[model samples]
Target: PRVSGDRTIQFLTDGYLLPSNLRKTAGLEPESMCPVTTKLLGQDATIVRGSAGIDLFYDEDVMQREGAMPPVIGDALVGKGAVHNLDGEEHKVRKAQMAAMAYEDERVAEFAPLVAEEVERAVAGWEGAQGNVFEDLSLAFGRAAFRWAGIDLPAENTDELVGRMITLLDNFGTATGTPKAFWQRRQLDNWAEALITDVREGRITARPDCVLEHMAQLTDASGERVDARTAGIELQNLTRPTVAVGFFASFAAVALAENPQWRTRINESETGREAFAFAQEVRRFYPFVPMFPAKATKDTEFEGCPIHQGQRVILDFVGTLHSAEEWDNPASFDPERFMAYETQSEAETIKPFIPQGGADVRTGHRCPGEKIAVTALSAAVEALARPEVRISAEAIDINYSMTEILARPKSGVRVTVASS
Candidate 1:
């Protein structure tokens, strides 16, 4: 029998909250993989949920990604040749280039400050205007991404570009196609392809140190340069994920407003460690991507569950993060668990806290932008924790819905700077 009755319908309706609801009534286990047979795109499929499942699913040797996603969803979101779609040596070679561009110390150093500057400038703009935390941070980080990623655009076009990126990201993982999102993704891809073509043709010179320049020159495992269209998709891969850092930033804002003591703790800490912990905790607690979808590379069994080739496997991120077996109090919001990383040797890897995918990011399909997301979010958290920034608890009323690809607050967290 399936994990619960009519799970596919439930998943379609529940959105981000489906896993938690399953746990409550369907006897879902944390330490053990829970398998549910369901229908995806009018075909039989399986969804697996557990912490251990994350490690198993991300093992490219065990599960393949080639046909795991709905083609329209994958192309629109991750693109044709994004590293996440490749496997084996091909995947490693492509992933290495992306990692180099993403994890460079100098690049991160340059990027974080740009994001910080945007945050401050955005705060200045919000002095009298009603501050919508998600929209404000998304637009701010979008501007920062463009500036630091070396995409040259006119000042007036910043918001439009940001809107395009946001719309594409926001459409990812939706249960069904959205016509507007589909059009927006196409438009963004076209714009990026044209931009790359111009740079390659000497119509516009690419920046010396920008990500676009690196991507334009990057080679694949076959020792051939990626085509303009693929390079454009790869370029969007870099900026789109960076813009996603805004989601976590908004979550951090709501967290600080509700848990004011954490704000004080972060402010008092001289080392910036507390702020990082707060950001980490927010990522773990929030409902971002519901699951990592994969397919059985070969016949295998997880936790004694039967498996077959070509079966869809979903590594449940939300279920694992909130597992009682892994966390002391899984449901409660706590930053100290992260702070304890200094003293506890095993805390780092003991629990599969994969807000991003688990394991070696450089080698695996794990997001190369993980560090950037954490760093930018930590910076945003610190900046917002300042006493000058007054967040209204009443204005931060959160309404949750999982229908969209990203789970967002209906009314974004509101703020007013006391004295900018």
Candidate 2:
């Protein structure tokens, strides 16, 4: 879910290039369903509105990508969009299979140890990393994911493969890196297409129903088996998002650095809920992807906001997370805001609690990697907060841009982790 062309807003000609500026102002305006009439990428666009307006965008019945324009970032990561830009039956079946393979109960539990093990290993070796612990963990996370997905990478190629995968996330949503990322995409596609092809040719034995196997045999919306390159892109679809968890993890580092109480709670608490809460708060507090775009299939109304056929709308993730109608103090970072809900399922039911993306997972456009992102970031947060570990930075600050689509903390949040 991305908007293509002219990423910034001139705001002079009485129109915006993209509707993201609306996201920056959505929470402050004191509107539940805030509607905006503007042209997006030179097309008729209307934001169905704020936190309440989010549901309408997630509703596949009205807002859809089937007959709509494709997302540039979507095309950047997955050329022409895999699940990101797809809609209707292809999206439903493909997203369902993807959800099962990546974020479902069994797979999440299975993947947690792999993430924990990687996180644990990374923390153990962070004797005094003056470098970005963010990039370091990306390496650890990547190794665990390749093993989890049964993607065979020669020992020599592991770092190269994972670096490119991480770059795909870093570069895809921005203008500067997309140029290099497109080239990396070709290399990434080549890698997975070869693996998927081997699985098809019976040359490799991928785990039954695993990403490698499932992707190889999965059918497209066109009702035929996706070709090797498409399967390859889908394979990347899993790893890329998993790698994207580093963004959340990095922000968690910054959050913990700024808040000592929560850091100690995550450091000393047991049963894992405190760490999970901290992760959720980090996602909500920091800047990542503020908004995502979608188009209306037919006329739809959300809280009386009329969105006509073919009208593109922006779903504000930050606006919903920070909505005054939703939280007590929408601007402050409070991990305890999550304490109201006992479990992840219960927490997600709190409609305005969408730090990632909102609505339903099984039937909507919610990122399929939600659970994995949580588990991975939670694991990394736990590791970074271990009693023996401490983050040392001259000053705590998140390096982000008002104009950039995906914002990260301080050049991958460089910090030194020293053990007591």
Candidate 3:
């Protein structure tokens, strides 16, 4: 095992770059999972790189997800009892309920217009104002999430609620906590708890088949009713990440600005399948989720690297997605690859393109809302690609420094909405 350097403080200060730094300093191969040892948050840690490591991390017999995550980050962002916090049969069951909520064809159909309504309304307001597409789209998704999930709040509280939720997501991966993010999470916790409480007290009757209704009815591993707060966290887990699709939308705008011909093709194409392909390539080419935190379930060996029980290990999602061994010209944005895979099974096609977790959603920790994310992103790009919406290619700037937790462009994809 090799350590990157002696600068432990610098690593946390710029932790997002640490994985790339390690890859360069240690001369790691594209397909290897050799353990690169380091200290993170004052604890000894190992960063596992490449596709084979992803396989090992997803293997239930080898690795576990819960209890490995940084406590402060996990609590503020995902909270207790979210699906990521469950494991074994309990995780499988919760994931089933989440899949039922997210992946039914009818639900996807229902969600698109909910998303479109917010996006269109927000875009309409940007005729004169300099629209930060990320903020607008995130807020749009936030409003749609509340409405679609049957969280009925007073009109006056909508903006505050949306702000708080976005803040919780925005600051989740900061090496040190930000004060505003801390308080925002506290306020949002109260908000979620109150909503859950109202449902139990019969003060609010959530829609019969809505997310809140389903989450409130969930049973734990012991077959007992899940607590209200835990269910609320799971609710946010579903909704916040859906809103985070705005990041991909912002990146898609950048892609459209640079590759005008692709936009023209998408606009002229009847079925809009090309728009889906464009979105898939944006996910592949950009940095969103950096890594997934997991721990060894027992003594295990991955590619000759011994992993002891409870050892902190990171599955480098960013590294795997960009592996030269997996993706041809991995750094470039090319939607053509997705077009080529249209006839192939998803299992055969998707293993190499894991912007989200690479496991089976129904049985593993892979996010259940991936279908919703793709649909939402496809809708976003299709709307942005229309001739009326102009994104300034020269003005767009993505700050690599702040991209550790998620892809946050410094300028927020500045745009002038002319029409559509």
Candidate 4:
């Protein structure tokens, strides 16, 4: 028996995870959390639950529903062992090996120029017609992401590959019978097939200074090479439908456009800290829709909720970051909250306000691309924030609807730029 609110719930839409039983005992039709919600939840309301003994999907039947390929298709993309799956020694080993790229500040810095390059590339083709900024920016960023990782998917094939990846990420948990969902799966399957082939062949080289290369190569304690199949699946799991990051990328632009004053302050060389802090606050304040599922290692409790074994737990990142309880003036966009201190301790606001290298990323299997993401976000905001650039875009409203996973702007913002 549940003790919460009732709503139209699907595995992905609702806040529940499908237990392992559904996949092992039952056919893995709509496996994992989102699908379980979709399968069981009536219009009235519902909850999907499960446990895989082990936390990761690859070890269990969670991937059973997938056809011939391995179930960890998505994880392979993020980098093997970068996520929370392996746990204990295995997790530590994988994370250490995979984190080599993060160790180099220079590699992280390279993202800024690349982001600028991609944005510039996208701007050249900006039709200003009800162009689907969501898809457009996502595609552009996907290319940039692959390129950053030192892989080159030719322009001719990039669109098709990226489009399929988008479908895999965005439409993972809809009713399969629906025409759109059916069509999307077919397209994504084809794309996945192609990506696997590309990875095997040396034809597609990610950007030499990209994080992708590190993810592709797995090393042991002695620094010897290991297989990359698992790494590739993890990468796909995280990046397959990576539309949310691009959505927020533009969202940051719009935030700057609306609060032009903030931009002006950040452009000054003296206010670099403020700008970086402000950008962090923006990320914390922005809404990233729910669907990221985490499994309970065992029966544990947090914030008074019983996290039963094998149950899937979805972190309300958007809600949690914006929660009044989590911060002072949760509604206000203030960068001062993330200022670094000379002698920092847990009491300082820097811990919570900064998303990139905070406890969030340090603990568990946090976001692997966070450093690169923050660097990219900071540069983009700084570039747009300067007084030299004039941005006039429509007021973008955020959507918290069930259907929309990422915070979607009801309409794309249209802007005319004039460099001062």
What TM-score against the true fold does each predicted structure earn? 0.92, 0.89, 0.92, 0.66
Report residue 182 deviation for candidate 1 (angstroms).
1.2
TM-score of 3: 0.92
List residue ranges in candidate 1 displaced over 4 A.
4-7, 22-33, 42-44, 172-177, 341-351, 402-404
In angstroms, give how far residue 98 of model 1 lies from its true place. 0.7
In order, the Cα lDDT scores of the candidates are 0.76, 0.72, 0.76, 0.48
Candidate 1 lDDT over 291-379, as tens digits, reads 77788888888776676788787777887787777678988999987986531123236447778877667767777676678778887
Ranking by TM-score: 3, 1, 2, 4
lDDT string, candidate 2, 1-420, tens digits: 222344334432222223445534444244445565555666656554455577677777777875354455566666654777788888888888788787677888888898889887777676665556678788888887887887776866977999998877777655567788787887887888888899999999888867778889878767789888887888888887788778777777777777888877876777788888888888777767666678888787655557778877776666666667777887898888876655566667777767667888878878767777888888888877765566655444455444554666556766555644
Per-residue CA lDDT of model 3 for 1-420, tens digit only, reads 666445456545555666777766677664455667676665556787566767877889878888888767777777766788878999988888888888766787788888888888878777766787788888888888778777778866876788787777677666554565667777776777777777877898988988888877877767897788877777777788887888888888888888999999999999877898898888888888777788878887766766778877787777777777777888788899787544212523467567788767787888777778887788788888888787765543443344356556767788878753
N/CA/C clash count, model 4:
41
Per-residue C-alpha lDDT of model 4 across residues 108-153, encoded as one tens digit per residue: 5665577668766665454333334456566766776666556465
Q: What are the per-model numbers of colliding residue pairs?
A: 0, 2, 0, 41
- Model 3 spans > 4 angstroms off: 4-11, 29-33, 41-44, 175-177, 341-349, 394-404
Model 4 segments more than 4 A misplaced = 1-84, 124-136, 167-170, 173-216, 219-229, 234-243, 268-271, 289-292, 300-307, 339-363, 386-403, 418-420
